[PDB]
Design a protein around this ligand. Structure first.
Ligand SMILES: Nc1ncnc2c1ncn2[C@@H]1O[C@H](COP(=O)(O)OP(=O)(O)O)[C@@H](O)[C@H]1O
Ligand SMILES: Nc1ncnc2c1ncn2[C@@H]1O[C@H](COP(=O)(O)OP(=O)(O)O)[C@@H](O)[C@H]1O
Ligand SMILES: Nc1ncnc2c1ncn2[C@@H]1O[C@H](COP(=O)(O)OP(=O)(O)O)[C@@H](O)[C@H]1O
Ligand SMILES: [Mg+2]
Ligand SMILES: [Mg+2]
Ligand SMILES: [Mg+2]
Lengths: 525, 536, 317, 526
């Protein structure tokens, strides 16, 4: 060929062969991910080269963990990664719709049709589908019940049903706490701490904070009832001078004086803390907890323990904000002019030892604008799975709140959009109508696979559902327990409008760009 | 081997002479195809994909990887011609190789190499004399178009050939710009002070001659202006950075209250220097050293243009051209530190100009002297490098034409006339030196032969016509105007090259002959070769 | 891919994972074209190399260097490639926090990892367990490594490097003449199994130089004895030497003999010190960055944003 | 033994003659055939695989040729001229390759027929000069104040690219960006769309929400969460200096013998930071942006003044923030002046896009810098959108500099080819044949357009070559979407005269370069 005469070690796939490559890879991905879709899907186990185990049903995780070296698979994995980074859910469905668009386009390109016409039909169908989506979207006041149904629709796909019923309340309560009226939800204000000791259904929402470390001085209390929290970012350990000072003495007595003096700088900050503590709690009734983003040497730990202060050091840069929003103080980088108004309050602070590590709970805050999800479970992979599930659920509830609209689920919107595309087809000029048909049969992959996963006949279920939607018009989807049509909005099966829109847009775009590929080429050597 | 026991190989006699001639011939055949308006360029690939296109014989023989000493000699010959003249680097190699060939033919006939060398030396002397006495034209009689014609002749065979009609103007202008007179009032044209920059993009016809200077540098900060009109220029040979105490100086604090002030001087010292400069009116500050961000901010706030890491030679040229004084230090003969406005230079404009996604500095209309820059514009870096080499050849040629005001005709005219004259002159000198001088004469014909061969024309017929014309000129005193006849390679016909405008500096041919003769003599003296095995 | 910047108290020796040689040896590594393709480099050419004795003095310098070892000598973008930097053994935490703040905040690197130079040296030799004796120009280090990680508790640090070595030789003053003594140090300086039989025909012993702490063989022996008694076999039998200092005398067998003497008469000690690839640390870094366990060890950008200097310090205080 | 007594090094291979000529020409026309199908509006994408595991899905001639690797020096030269075209005008990077390939192809004819390469070259130079004359003759001016005319000019440049589906959107972006980057200082106009028009690709979202900001955007958050994240009239200060306490450049070694000296020194460090922060607060800013670090004590002092800080920004981002908010970067807060403070920004926001915090300095008035925020499905799609937008912006710039237009659809190629053929009838020497061959070699652009449209080259080219023999038909060309001849005045495909001039010059000069070449040599070390 052309490239192989100049770079002999070049790999090239031309026109039809290139199409053959790309579509084949897409269909391969679909075959892997088809089983991930829905609550009746199957969990895959993924073993790293080190031997670490992952139990997952998540499309993005599955992609990045499968062992694949294909360029089309790389493209589709990146599209799914963007879907996950922006919406948190929709990756499996993204891959499925991409694969099905490519397959339905191969249906007509094998018949000698040019991919350009299919892509024109794709663009027309995208427009009409986005219109029908905005029309059918359900604008709803996001109440705890609506958000609970949303989070259920996500967690029931990602985890077991009882654990999903737990994570639902956990996630919805978590978001409804860190949420400020008409102010985008900062999910950073939900810490996510995992503990590896108890059952997975013990995963809870602490209306406060859980630090993965505790006090390093033993004489420090392990439980504090009415606590003043001092969130600081001030070094309380020995800091050497920037200018390489060095000490010079002529006598052991002078050496002793210099040893006592070299710590005066940090002794002064410890003294400031101790004076604040004494001035704010003159008795032993209340407690005082210092949480430092920086270090605290053993001398400072002793000095603070002697006065009855619980000092934790080298906390996380995000815990500064989480503590100032949960407890309610001010985070400090200096103790120059500190006042009791710089302190937060916690109605309980205590310590929990788990094997070799320590955790510190800060609870009974007044109205914490930051909370934590304590992911308890008996196994590392259980914890990872629950983390992925709660990420999905948090993104789902956040998106349902941000986008006050919510879309019916169980493939209902896909069925209805397919019918609408099929009714719209004649209005398209030329043979791009065939691309529209392909788009419809691509949209129809969501209910089909759901049936495929619940153990039903794709064709029979899909005809039943489309018939029910044409006779009634009720947005209906798959009942995974009977295989019959069901009204998703009535049974509480909700999807995110943002997710469906992102699916349509990104899937159409990547499928168009793949269909217009006519040469794959590796010639960089 | 055998009796000697030397740890090496030994070639002796006709064997080593044949080897030397083969080596020289090899080198000459490498470059023969790049001679004259019909010569063609060469690619050279450097075992890594680095490509070099060129017609310059010196360049070609520099890039080659030669092992034979008799071929290294010709490479060094081309290098020497390129250093001392700037043109003739291919003709000199061809002529040296042909002298070697014919001289080895004579040595095979058992003419002693001493006799061949004597004859070659005599023929060189007499050819130089005959050129200097009969074949020179004074450029004064011709005016300025003589320089343009010499430039076009030098640029023919290069990638700026057909466009010579215009490139020669630039070349001539450039040398005239860099003209400067020294003690004895002799005019000197110091090329290599013309700056030549390369920038792929617009066609060759868009190459630019800047009356002034062009710097492959840019301003140091994006907040600085990028055009200044009444440019007052300060050329500094020191860096403007936070002051660091030298090696034998230490700061040792024993009272912390002094530390702050010491740190402050580390920067305030430099600040004061810059303020002094800016106090004189300097709007443009070029420095061979660096400029910290702290200093660049002072230049930004003053509305000045600072440039760092300028090259010493570029700085020397900008200083000489604008009237500035390169200062290595702000230090006077009064033990203080100041900067006088007399140390400044001037220029009617300084701009940061865009050239194909790459900016440079243009200093335009400098006073106290005129300077010259040339921005070559082609399709890619290979073409631009070939244009730079071609332009260097043309500039050197124009410089030689202006220093010595004598030119000779081209197109093999000089070689044909010398062949005739020397084949007639050999009859007087000995009996074997006669053969050597006749062979020198015949060897000189390799230039028109090669020109015609490259033109894809009948070399034999053309060179015979040439020799007929030149014999008519040398035996008929009424026809000396035939001396100016040489080859027309676009039609395959002799032509009055003095009227056609094919001129070459006399020094070109003279030095070609002298160097070729010495190289041939050097190689022709070797009758043995001991190639030792490597020490390892 | 993954950029593998090997500081190694040498030059930058930067490049990509998979390359058998670095592509960006900046310190002590065109013109007449148009643009700023020489001036920008001409600035760095005369800039002092920040790392001295295996420790970063000037951080602004180092940052400017890295920036010029990304945009100029690699012509790439760090915002999409993970970076593997290298640090000297027992490198202060503060330097780690500084370089991690530079990479994640300035260069906005998606993920990065800091590896010990001795561990990467051992990697380039193909092994994952052993005790590395790294003696360069300013420092000497014994790094016990088990399962591929430098045990942070058995790192014995003594100081007898090229400088300290050439010192006594100078004794046997001016820069040029002590560099004649150092030229002899650079050239053959065969290690003596026994100085008795070596001086007859004419670091191991502190008294020789004038120190009073320990020999390098004692150092290795005690670094092996402060580890697990089961991995003791591997430490004793996989001692890998590195450093031009230790290479110049070519010390293998004198060490081997006196270490065997110190050790019980059980473990057989074999020292592999013939490589001298002159890029061992770089190749070890490339191997690590090529592996997938490097993705495992990634300090990610999100991790950095969430934890700061704590993520750089890997918690466990 | 008797080691080889060579003259040149072993591995030095030297080719010569018509084989070298034919080899160079075949390599060139192969480079051409690689991207021949990537020309016009009906082109198809190519997915190239980088050595770094990356992927590049594109239609851009220079992208494709830059991603492939070759060893033949002629192919090297063709890739280099594609790079030249991309750097100079930023469009036509594949038209140039095709034209150069066709010129070399037609010169092969004359070279096989005993003509000398210099003759062909002189003819090529004549033809190039006459092309220049004809283009400058048929060009028309443009009123750059007509935003719709400019949007049509930019559409005629992106119609051949993937963003064509959001063509109008992208057109506005490019136009807006360029109109903001136009800057004049001291009588020097500057459209520097490489340092001051930045493209930030954030995967996710939808492309239709991508926008050009009246300001800049960086990936940054406040240094301390007590700092504001939303400021509606920010006074902004820019710094090149560290707000930390760093060492001195000299050996500033200290020597302590008294007790109070250590504490006094550490308090001196704190006082230095205090004095820097006070020198800054005296200008009363709302936002402080540094290229270097900011110590936590400095953060405390700035926050006390209710100032928001962003710690470690790039010098390029700092320069764009300068141009956008109207500030002046300083390096010594003692040298800070009101003229160096940044007024002009209308809003500073720090918002969460996905899981990242992005700093916007938007709502600026008269910002001489901008950030194009691209949103889309993936990094590959957005890299392609960025390249297409580069094409659009480079075209807008070429227009604003030289407002002359020429017709597209191959109309210009046929008009100029016809003019050259008509001028050739006065030529009586032997160069008329290569000259007319270059005229027939310009025809390849419409040929390629027709081929990529899927129409009949013979018929359409015949009708078009005939149309261009009439009087007022120099604007007639072909559609790349239907395969019919049209008037460009009726279609609207008009390219910048500068683009096509540079295209023709690069093509002809590349042909001259490869024709002069003979006698390849190889092997010798560097
Ligand atoms: N209880 C349910 N009954 C029927 N369909 C459901 C139910 N819960 C979720 N679905 C549908 O299953 C599909 C896939 O779910 P999930 O796997 O979470 O999405 P993704 O495939 O993007 O990860 C969604 O389109 C959702 O509407
Ligand atoms: N236009 C011309 N017509 C005839 N002869 C020429 C012309 N230009 C150059 N020559 C001849 O070609 C010879 C070599 O020219 P050239 O190859 O360009 O320089 P060099 O020998 O230094 O490489 C010169 O001796 C000159 O006599
Ligand atoms: N709708 C159209 N119909 C016909 N020709 C077009 C159309 N749009 C652009 N062209 C032509 O296509 C060429 C541009 O090709 P393109 O694919 O952009 O590659 P290049 O990088 O060479 O511009 C120009 O000659 C332009 O006139
Ligand atoms: Mg989901
Ligand atoms: Mg010449
Ligand atoms: Mg274009």
């Amino acid at each position: 060929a052309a490239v192989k005469t100049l770079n002999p070690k070049a790999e090239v796939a031309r026109a039809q062969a290139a199409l053959a490559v790309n579509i084949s890879a897409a269909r391969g991905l679909q075959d892997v991910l088809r089983t991930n879709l829905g609550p009746k899907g199957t969990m895959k186990m993924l073993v790293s080269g080190a031997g670490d185990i992952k139990l997952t049903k998540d499309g993005n995780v599955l992609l990045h963990e499968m062992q694949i070296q294909h360029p089309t698979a790389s493209l589709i994995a990146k599209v799914a990664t963007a879907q996950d980074d922006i919406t948190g859910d929709g990756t499996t469905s993204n891959v499925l719709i991409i694969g099905e668009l490519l397959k339905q386009a191969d249906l007509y390109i094998s018949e000698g049709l040019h991919p350009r016409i299919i892509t024109e039909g794709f663009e027309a169908a995208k427009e009409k589908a986005l219109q029908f989506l905005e029309e059918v979207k359900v604008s709803r006041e996001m109440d705890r019940e609506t958000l609970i149904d949303v989070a259920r629709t996500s967690l029931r796909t990602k985890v077991h049903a009882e654990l999903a019923d737990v994570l639902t309340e956990a996630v919805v309560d978590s978001i409804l706490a860190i949420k400020k009226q008409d102010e985008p939800i900062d999910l950073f204000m939900i810490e996510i701490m995992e503990m590896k000791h108890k059952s997975e259904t013990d995963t809870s929402l602490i209306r406060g904070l859980v630090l993965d470390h505790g006090a390093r001085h033993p004489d420090m209390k392990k439980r504090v009832e009415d606590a003043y929290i001092l969130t600081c970012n001030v070094s309380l350990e020995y800091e050497k001078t920037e200018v390489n000072s060095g000490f010079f003495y002529k006598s052991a007595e002078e050496r002793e004086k210099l040893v006592k003096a070299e710590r005066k700088f940090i002794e002064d900050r410890v003294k400031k803390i101790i004076e604040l503590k004494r001035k704010v709690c003159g008795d032993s009734d209340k407690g005082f907890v210092v949480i430092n983003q920086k270090g605290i040497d053993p001398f400072s730990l002793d000095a603070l323990s002697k006065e009855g202060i619980v000092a934790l050091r080298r906390a996380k840069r995000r815990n500064m904000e989480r503590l100032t929003l949960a407890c309610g103080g001010v985070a400090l980088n200096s103790f120059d002019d500190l006042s009791p108004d710089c302190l937060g309050h916690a109605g309980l602070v205590y310590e929990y030892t788990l094997g070799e590590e320590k955790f510190t709970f800060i609870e009974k805050c007044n109205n914490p604008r930051s909370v934590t999800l304590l992911i308890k479970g008996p196994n590392k992979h259980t914890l990872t799975q629950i983390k992925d599930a709660v990420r999905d659920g948090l993104r789902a509830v956040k998106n349902a709140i941000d986008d006050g609209c919510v879309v019916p689920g169980a493939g209902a919107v896909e069925v209805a959009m397919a019918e609408a595309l099929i009714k719209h087809k004649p209005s398209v000029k030329g043979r791009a109508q065939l691309g529209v048909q392909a788009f419809a049969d691509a949209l129809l992959i969501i209910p089909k696979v759901l049936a495929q996963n619940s153990g039903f006949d794709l064709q029979e279920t899909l005809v039943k559902i489309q018939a029910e939607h044409s006779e009634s018009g009720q947005l209906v989807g798959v009942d995974l327990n009977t295989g019959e049509p069901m009204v998703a909005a009535e049974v509480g099966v909700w999807d995110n409008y943002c997710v469906k829109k992102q699916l349509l847009h990104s899937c159409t775009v990547i499928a168009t760009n793949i269909l217009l590929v006519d040469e794959i080429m590796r010639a960089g050597m | 081997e055998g009796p000697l026991s030397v740890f090496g190989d030994r070639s002796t006699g006709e064997t080593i002479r044949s080897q030397n001639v083969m080596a020289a011939a090899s080198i000459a055949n490498i470059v023969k195809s790049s001679l004259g308006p019909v010569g063609l360029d060469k690619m050279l690939v450097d075992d890594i994909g680095d490509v070099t296109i060129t017609n310059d014989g010196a360049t070609i023989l520099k890039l080659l990887e030669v092992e034979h000493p008799a071929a290294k000699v010709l490479c060094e010959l081309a290098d020497l011609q390129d250093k001392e003249v700037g043109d003739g680097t291919t003709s000199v190699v061809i002529i040296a190789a042909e002298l070697l060939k014919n001289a080895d033919e004579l040595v095979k006939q058992k003419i002693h190499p001493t006799s061949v060398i004597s004859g070659y030396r005599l023929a060189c002397k007499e050819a130089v004399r005959y050129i200097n006495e009969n074949l020179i034209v004074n450029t004064d009689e011709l005016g300025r178009d003589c320089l343009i014609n010499a430039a076009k002749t030098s640029m023919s065979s290069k990638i700026i050939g057909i466009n010579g009609d215009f490139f020669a103007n630039m070349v001539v202008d450039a040398v005239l710009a860099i003209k400067y007179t020294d003690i004895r009032g002799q005019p000197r044209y110091p090329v290599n002070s013309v700056n030549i920059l390369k920038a792929h993009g617009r066609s060759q016809m868009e190459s630019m001659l800047i009356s002034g200077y062009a710097l492959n540098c840019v301003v140091g900060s994006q907040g600085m202006p990028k055009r200044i009109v009444n440019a007052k220029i300060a050329c500094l040979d020191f860096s403007l950075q936070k002051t660091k105490m030298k090696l034998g100086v230490q700061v040792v604090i024993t009272d912390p209250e002094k530390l702050d002030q010491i740190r402050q001087r580390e920067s305030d010292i430099t600040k004061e220097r810059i303020q002094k400069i800016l106090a004189t009116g300097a709007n443009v500050i070029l420095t061979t050293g660096g400029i910290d961000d702290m200093c660049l901010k002072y230049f930004v706030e003053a509305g000045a243009m600072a440039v760092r890491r300028v090259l010493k030679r570029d700085l020397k040229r900008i200083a000489k051209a604008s009237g500035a004084t390169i200062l290595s230090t702000l230090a006077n003969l009064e033990g203080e530190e100041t900067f006088e406005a007399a140390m400044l230079g001037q220029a009617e404009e300084v701009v940061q100009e865009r050239i194909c996604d790459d900016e440079l500095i243009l200093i335009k209309n400098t006073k106290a002297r005129t300077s010259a820059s040339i921005i070559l514009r082609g399709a890619n870096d290979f073409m631009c490098d070939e244009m730079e080499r071609s332009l260097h050849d043309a500039l050197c040629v124009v410089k030689r034409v202006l220093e010595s005001k004598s030119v000779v005709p081209g197109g093999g005219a000089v070689e044909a006339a010398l062949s005739i004259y020397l084949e007639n002159y050999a009859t007087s000198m000995g009996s074997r030196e006669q053969l050597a001088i006749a062979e020198f004469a015949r060897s000189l014909l390799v230039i028109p032969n090669t020109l015609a061969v490259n033109a894809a024309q009948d070399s034999t017929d053309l060179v015979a016509k040439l020799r007929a014309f030149h014999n008519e000129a040398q035996v008929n005193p009424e026809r000396k105007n035939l001396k100016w006849i040489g080859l027309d390679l676009s039609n395959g016909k002799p032509r009055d090259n003095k009227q056609a405008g094919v001129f070459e500096p006399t020094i070109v041919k003279v030095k070609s002959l002298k160097f070729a003769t010495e190289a041939a003599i050097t190689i022709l003296r070797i009758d043995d070769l001991i190639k030792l095995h490597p020490e390892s | 891919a993954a950029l593998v910047i090997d500081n190694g108290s040498g030059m930058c020796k930067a490049g990509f994972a998979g390359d058998d040689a670095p592509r960006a040896v900046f310190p002590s590594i065109k013109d007449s074209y148009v643009g700023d393709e020489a001036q920008s480099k001409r600035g760095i050419l005369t800039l002092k190399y920040p790392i001295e004795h295996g420790i970063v003095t000037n951080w602004d310098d180092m940052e400017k260097i890295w920036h010029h070892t990304f945009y100029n000598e690699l012509r790439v973008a760090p915002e999409e490639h993970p970076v593997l930097l290298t640090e000297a053994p027992l490198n202060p935490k503060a330097n780690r926090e500084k370089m991690t703040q530079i990479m994640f905040e300035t260069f906005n690197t998606p993920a990065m990892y800091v590896a010990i130079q001795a561990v990467l040296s051992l990697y380039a030799s193909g092994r994952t367990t052993g005790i590395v004796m790294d003696s360069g120009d300013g420092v000497t280090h014994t790094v016990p490594i088990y399962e591929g990680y430098a045990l942070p508790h058995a790192i014995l640090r003594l100081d007898l490097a090229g400088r300290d070595l050439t010192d006594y030789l100078m004794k046997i003053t001016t820069t040029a003449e002590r560099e004649i003594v150092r030229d002899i140090k650079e050239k053959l300086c065969y290690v003596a199994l026994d100085f008795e039989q070596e001086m007859a025909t004419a670091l191991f012993q502190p008294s020789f130089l004038g120190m009073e702490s320990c020999g390098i063989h004692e150092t290795t022996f005690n670094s092996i004895m402060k580890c697990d008694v089961d991995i003791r076999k591997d430490l004793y039998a996989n001692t890998v030497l590195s450093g031009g200092t230790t290479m110049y005398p070519g010390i293998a067998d004198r060490m081997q003999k006196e270490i065997t003497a110190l050790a019980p008469s059980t473990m057989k000690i074999k020292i592999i010190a013939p490589p001298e690839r002159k890029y061992s640390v770089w190749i070890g870094g490339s191997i690590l960055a090529s592996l997938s366990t490097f993705q495992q060890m990634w300090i990610s950008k999100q991790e950095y944003d969430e934890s700061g200097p704590s993520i750089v310090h890997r918690k466990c205080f | 033994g008797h080691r080889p007594v060579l003259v040149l090094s072993q591995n030095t291979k030297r080719e010569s003659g018509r084989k070298v000529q034919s080899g160079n020409i075949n390599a060139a026309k192969t480079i051409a055939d690689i991207i021949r199908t990537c020309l016009g509006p009906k082109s198809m994408m190519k997915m190239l695989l980088d050595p770094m595991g990356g992927i590049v899905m594109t239609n851009d001639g220079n992208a494709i040729l830059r991603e492939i690797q070759v060893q033949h020096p002629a192919a090297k030269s063709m890739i280099e001229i594609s790079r030249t075209q991309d750097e100079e005008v930023g469009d036509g990077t594949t038209s140039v390759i095709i034209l150069a390939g066709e010129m070399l192809s037609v010169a092969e004819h004359f070279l096989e027929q005993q003509m000398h390469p210099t003759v062909v070259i002189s003819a090529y130079r004549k033809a190039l000069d006459d092309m220049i004359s004809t283009l400058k003759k048929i060009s028309i001016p443009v009123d750059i104040s007509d935003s719709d005319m400019m949007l049509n000019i930019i559409n005629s440049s992106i119609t051949t690219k993937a963003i064509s589906r959001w063509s109008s959107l992208a057109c506005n972006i490019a136009l807006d960006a360029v109109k903001m980057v136009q800057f004049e200082e001291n009588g020097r106009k500057e459209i520097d769309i490489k340092k001051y028009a930045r493209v930030e690709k954030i995967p996710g979202g939808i492309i239709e929400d991508s926008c050009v900001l009246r300001g800049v955007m960086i990936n940054k958050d406040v240094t301390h969460p007590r700092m504001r994240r939303y400021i509606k009239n920010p006074r902004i200060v820019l710094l090149d200096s560290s707000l930390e306490y760093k060492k001195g450049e000299s050996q500033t070694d200290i020597e302590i013998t008294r007790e109070e000296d250590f504490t006094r020194i550490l308090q001196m460090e704190e006082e230095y930071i205090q004095q820097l922060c006070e020198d800054i607060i005296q200008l009363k800013p709302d936002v402080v942006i540094t290229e270097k670090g900011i110590s936590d004590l400095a953060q405390h002092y700035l926050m006390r003044a209710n100032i928001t800080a962003i710690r470690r920004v790039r010098k390029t981002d700092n320069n764009r923030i300068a141009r956008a908010c109207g500030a002046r970067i300083v390096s010594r807060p003692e040298e800070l002046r009101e003229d160096d403070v940044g007024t002009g920004a209308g809003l500073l926001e720090i918002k969460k896009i996905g899981d990242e915090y992005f700093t916007f300095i938007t709502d600026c008035k008269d910002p001489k810098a901008c950030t194009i925020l691209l949103r889309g499905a993936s990094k590959e799609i957005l890299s392609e959108v960025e390249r297409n937008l580069q094409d659009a912006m480079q075209v807008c710039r070429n227009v604003l500099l030289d407002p002359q237009l020429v017709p597209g659809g191959g109309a210009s190629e046929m008009a100029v080819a016809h003019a050259l053929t008509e001028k050739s009838k006065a030529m009586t020497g032997v160069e008329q044949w290569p000259y007319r061959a270059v005229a027939q070699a310009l025809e390849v652009i419409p040929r390629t357009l027709i081929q990529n449209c899927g129409a009949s080259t013979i018929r359409l080219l015949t009708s078009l070559r005939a149309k261009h023999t009439q009087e007022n038909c120099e604007t007639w060309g072909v559609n790349g979407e239907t395969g019919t001849l049209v008037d460009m005045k009726e279609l609207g495909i008009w390219e910048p005269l500068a683009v096509k001039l540079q295209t023709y010059k690069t093509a002809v000069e590349t042909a001259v370069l490869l024709l002069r070449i003979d006698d390849i040599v190889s092997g010798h070390k560097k």
